[PDB]
Amino acid sequence: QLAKAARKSAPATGGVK
Amino acid sequence: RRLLPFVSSEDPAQRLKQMGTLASALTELQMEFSDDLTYSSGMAPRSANQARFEEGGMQVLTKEDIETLEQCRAMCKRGDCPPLLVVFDSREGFTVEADGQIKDMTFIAEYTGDVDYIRNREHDDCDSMMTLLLAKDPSSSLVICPDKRGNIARFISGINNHTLDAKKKQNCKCVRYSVNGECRVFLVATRDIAKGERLYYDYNGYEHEYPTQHFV
Ligand SMILES: Nc1ncnc2c1ncn2[C@@H]1O[C@H](CSCC[C@H](N)C(=O)O)[C@@H](O)[C@H]1O
């Protein structure tokens, strides 16, 4: 019954390397 | 450290074959190709996508790296796609592999789809949502939804964050940069990837909103 929602996230600071 | 444009496959037939694997996977998921962020009705307006709303701030894409991004986008538009192949794998579903050499710091693709409020997507079954903007006010937070419109980015695999050896599979990285005051999500090779090597990045690179216990 209870509805849950997977989400990817990425950093917004620190560059690539 | 500078972003590098990709080197598309020299053989025109090879680029056709590549573009076809993406077209087949999109058609399989009943999706339309879109190499940009789309702002739809009953979802988020383009005005909602403002980088100054990121809690803690967002790094800014430099003039040098913006020209690199435009160069890759112009290439995609003209027909020079990145040297990637969409391949169905029974243990992972659709996956993305390098169909040519990709050096470290090479721009792979932008994470595209429909931008919507996280608040409108709290119980959305889409297995491919990606955080766009993380605001202090949770009603201002945005999510990229490649359920109806999207590109290659949504087919790229993630690493299992629970295994001792799964971090070793990561060869690319998902970052968020400010471009003309807006949030943008990009994929970059973190090491030299060979032809046939499967692309993997950390799906939980900022938050931990994606269950990966079962990943291969
Ligand atoms: N390392 C991995 N092992 C197993 N499944 C994975 C995985 N990386 C990605 N996946 C699968 O891919 C999903 C994220 S969306 C990536 C595209 C997807 N495989 C598709 O066929 O459309 C996950 O929810 C999971 O089902």
Side-chain angles (χ1 to χ4, degrees), chain A residues 1-3 5-16, chain B residues 2-27 29-31 33-49 51-54 56-62 64-69 72-100 102-135 137-163 165-212 214-216:
Chain A
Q1 272 245 265
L2 267 189
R7 197 153 36 88
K8 320 152 173 178
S9 53
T13 62
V16 179
Chain B
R2 173 192 74 249
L3 259 174
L4 303 174
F6 46 77
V7 181
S8 63
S9 292
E10 199 50 47
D11 188 357
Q14 194 170 29
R15 293 199 305 278
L16 246 304
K17 158 205 88 172
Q18 286 166 5
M19 285 181 284
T21 62
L22 179 57
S24 298
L26 289 165
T27 305
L29 307 203
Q30 297 179 248
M31 286 179 67
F33 177 73
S34 161
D35 232 331
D36 250 3
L37 291 166
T38 44
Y39 300 90
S40 306
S41 73
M43 287 174 77
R46 203 183 171 128
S47 71
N49 187 15
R52 52 187 187 89
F53 301 153
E54 185 66 12
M58 192 175 283
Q59 54 204 348
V60 314
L61 200 63
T62 65
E64 188 187 70
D65 286 343
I66 280 166
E67 294 153 4
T68 294
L69 172 73
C72 295
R73 295 162 59 82
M75 273 171 82
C76 277
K77 216 185 168 182
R78 113 191 154 177
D80 301 359
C81 58
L84 313 166
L85 220 65
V86 180
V87 172
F88 179 88
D89 181 90
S90 67
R91 301 168 302 149
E92 305 187 33
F94 285 114
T95 65
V96 175
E97 71 175 63
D99 198 53
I102 299 160
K103 46 194 165 167
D104 173 29
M105 289 299 310
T106 285
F107 169 84
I108 296 167
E110 189 192 338
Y111 208 115
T112 74
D114 288 323
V115 2
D116 202 356
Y117 294 104
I118 285 168
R119 259 248 57 187
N120 285 357
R121 302 292 175 140
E122 296 177 332
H123 300 313
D124 194 299
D125 299 315
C126 180
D127 68 2
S128 197
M129 292 181 286
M130 172 73 220
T131 312
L132 176 65
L133 173 61
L134 262 156
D137 192 325
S139 63
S140 289
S141 293
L142 305 171
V143 67
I144 309 156
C145 309
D147 54 334
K148 306 169 182 74
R149 294 113 206 161
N151 70 351
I152 208 145
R154 73 134 297 145
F155 302 105
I156 305 174
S157 284
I159 65 147
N160 187 311
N161 297 106
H162 299 79
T163 57
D165 68 318
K167 178 69 179 185
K168 291 177 189 283
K169 276 207 169 294
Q170 187 174 355
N171 52 21
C172 65
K173 195 195 186 187
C174 210
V175 284
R176 287 143 81 216
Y177 274 89
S178 185
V179 178
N180 306 311
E182 297 176 297
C183 304
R184 307 279 297 271
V185 180
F186 311 127
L187 281 115
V188 193
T190 59
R191 53 153 197 95
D192 289 3
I193 299 173
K195 186 168 184 168
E197 254 192 80
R198 191 166 282 164
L199 262 47
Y200 292 103
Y201 71 106
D202 193 353
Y203 278 4
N204 285 304
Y206 189 56
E207 316 176 70
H208 291 95
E209 292 294 329
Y210 213 104
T212 79
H214 62 105
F215 284 10
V216 117

